[PDB]
Amino acid sequence: MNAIGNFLVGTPVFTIFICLALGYLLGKLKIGSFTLGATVGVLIVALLIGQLGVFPRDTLLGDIFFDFFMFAIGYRVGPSFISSMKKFGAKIVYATLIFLVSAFIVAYACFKMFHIGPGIAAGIIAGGLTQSAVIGSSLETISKLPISDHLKTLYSNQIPIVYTLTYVFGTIGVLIFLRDIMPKLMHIDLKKQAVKTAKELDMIPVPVIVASTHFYTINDGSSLIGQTLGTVNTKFAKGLVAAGLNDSADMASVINAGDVLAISGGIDEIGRAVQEFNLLEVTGKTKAYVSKQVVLKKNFSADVLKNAQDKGVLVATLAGDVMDPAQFSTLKPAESVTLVGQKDAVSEVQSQLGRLRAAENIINYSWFALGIALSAALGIVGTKVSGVPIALGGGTASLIVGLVQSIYRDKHAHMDTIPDSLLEFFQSIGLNLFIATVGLSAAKTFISAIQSMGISVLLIGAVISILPHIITFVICYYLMKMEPISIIGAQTGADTLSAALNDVSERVGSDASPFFAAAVAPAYAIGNIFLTLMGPIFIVLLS
């Protein structure tokens, strides 16, 4: 009975990664009509495990794995923010401002009416308004602010316990309220209304067809044998070209017998070409005919574009698509494009068109590390407001750093892009690891604190977690008469619920997912910054 606790305290890695394994299973368990979720399951399992031992809490591991989560969230939100700012109106920002004001007023009123101490107030804020940087910011503010030392220790110790108590209700309750109750009240379907609104706007994604090189070989005795390749290419419709016979690129090489054309262009265009003149579609074996993407120079000469069209290299954008010849003159200078053709001829046109680009798969670890370092440096800075040393915080600055990096990489393509699955791994495991560490830390005195303050730490959290959403929903839908889905988006962005974001995104469908992302993106940054700042101000005010 003691040996198991000795083993658990001896090996922290086993404890941390065994409080993270069973949590996902508990979250994926289906009980009744609600699923607990990964974070809540991890918190419950950590709370149960932590009773056995006296495990302490490591600050650096949690800080790093939370900075990774914040950077991943900022990177994912990045591209949608500027698009929502351009196209969606300011009502998205206005809803967040209303929600923040309402939460401030309700929290102040409840804390004043119940005389809640500053430590419990910080815990209730950090739990009901689901933000994790509040714990660290409040600890730093409590350390800086002048009080008795015993008061400092008590206030610093009481925060994680109240955090773990109220976090349990916040995620599940607000998820249920924003996923079922509000759609039932508005008498809409989440899929249908969002699809209709996305159809009204132009957020609906449009698929892009990419040209490819298909190796059609010649039918012998087709009566077209004996025509020069340049005239055959001019015979092809707009957007077509033949790379050349075998792996060679020669202007005047008439058809001999059964040789390959390697037609490049759009699928329907190749189809009409085949119906114009029959050809054998053969898989072929050649590694020379490969496309390449290259960033252009500032001069971005178009005469070389015409000469490459004559030469046998199809022009396409970075995504890959045939484009109008009139776009040659009015192209964007120094814009990366993709071309298909011969092994070295594409490189020749590249040398005459611009510097070589870089592949998507490779990752700039130097840029990753520099982003993390700049996030920490930005979080260092802080100002004082009437004796309150407020600071941006470590996690909050990472969101801004990721946003700026994504926006700047969208324009300037010199830097490479982080793979998609890496971001999902980052956010998921980082958030669950931070939650597991906190829950393992605050576990021994859990039962003592739930004996000391039973109902005056859960009902307050429930009220502060539910009431502002109801007020802002009523104001937005009944009085101001906004659109249906943007209300959900703005509320779930202001409350900073990534689980609710993901659940509504997966329920709504892939068609309107770039709509919901645009609805949520402007809210997240303002909500995070103001909720991070709310903590120290509340501690100072109730103190």
Added chain:
Amino acid sequence: MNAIGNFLVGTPVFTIFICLALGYLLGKLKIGSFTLGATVGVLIVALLIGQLGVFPRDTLLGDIFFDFFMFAIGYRVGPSFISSMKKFGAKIVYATLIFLVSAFIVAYACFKMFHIGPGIAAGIIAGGLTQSAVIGSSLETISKLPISDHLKTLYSNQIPIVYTLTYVFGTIGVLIFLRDIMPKLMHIDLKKQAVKTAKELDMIPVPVIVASTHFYTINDGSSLIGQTLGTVNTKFAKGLVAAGLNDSADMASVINAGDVLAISGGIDEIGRAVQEFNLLEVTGKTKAYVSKQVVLKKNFSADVLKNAQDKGVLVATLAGDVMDPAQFSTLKPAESVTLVGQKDAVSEVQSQLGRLRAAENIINYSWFALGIALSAALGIVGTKVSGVPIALGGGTASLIVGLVQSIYRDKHAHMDTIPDSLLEFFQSIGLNLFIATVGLSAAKTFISAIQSMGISVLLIGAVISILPHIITFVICYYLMKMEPISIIGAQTGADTLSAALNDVSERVGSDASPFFAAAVAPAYAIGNIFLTLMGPIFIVLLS
């Protein structure tokens, strides 16, 4: 001058992630004809940075980020190990055994001839034989073994300093020796000889063609209008089927006008079909006609396979390819396969064929965490040999756990697969972070130790890093007369050099990369286990 040090010691995240950013740039700097590399650049930058402050070392962060690296390496090596054991001979294992014996003899002789103390001996082993778990295993062994307390502190403190000194020469020197000097001595080219040997064997990868659904629409008045769909499907050659008109699947629906066939099969087969009867290749817009992968049941009925061939569902393996009908009877029971067809008809055949499978992109975080926990638990176990409490170690057990998990997931496909870029991120950043932490730790007393022991800690490391490779190369090539490339593979696997592995793999070409991986894979596990065990034995013997 003091403020910068105060900032650096105040914020460990900034220091750790700023000693990791400049390191990659320094490694990618081109000086002369050699590149320093990421790990060596990080060590140099960490050593320069650590002079300013008094930063301590965190054990948990390094342990976790090294366990991730070891798990990623084991997962990548996994599939090749059993294939190399089956096809490559036992000479691969024999070369590693010879190398380990030679390294043991040379190290014992040098340490006895120079009376090197046990701590310096552990450091020299951990540096010259590039293995990082030696530090932790030696620290644990020194803690357990009975000596005077001052001796314990001195021996524990001297290890990282000697480690950082000799690690610099090991990677660069052995990389140069195994990449240029040995090919010059054997008078071979790394690309050509490996390609020839892979052609002699059957390690050469073979590309696989996957069938797809192409929506050919009907030419009006083609004289084939008015034939039932079943007879048209039987008219199609072996390996072809038409899903059905529009998005429907009806057996008797004659061609009306300009309707789509949605031909499915191999590209060349569709080409001969189009030449048999002309069709318009149109991109089309339909989301119903999507393929699915499903794991089969044990009964794996083949009558339903024939009925699905009649029905209009093409049969393919998980990779995706047309397969012979005679393979229907002799298929593997409960083997996952992929089918193309209608939105729900594929699900019908699935219901009659087996349980639904899972997608590639999704990751089982529960399996990841359980693997890490089992790695720690396996590393806990240990035995005693004449008073030496040897143990497997934390990092070493992770390699075995990853190997077993990859091998078991290859057979049983219920568990999902980790994405590829995640493994590369894991190994790279984890190894560089551990190296940065160690270098930042052992920096203040670096100059004092290089004043105390100048030349008697570098020449010994160079000799122990160079000489065993020369001996084993001479024995393998001149006396035993082995094959050329397997010598390089076995030596680079026995020395456990991931940088050398990656560099030779990228230089050799993608064609022979699954050959070099098979040549290196058997060596790595035995080398890691024996090099991890070598440390405590050496400490006890020289003590």
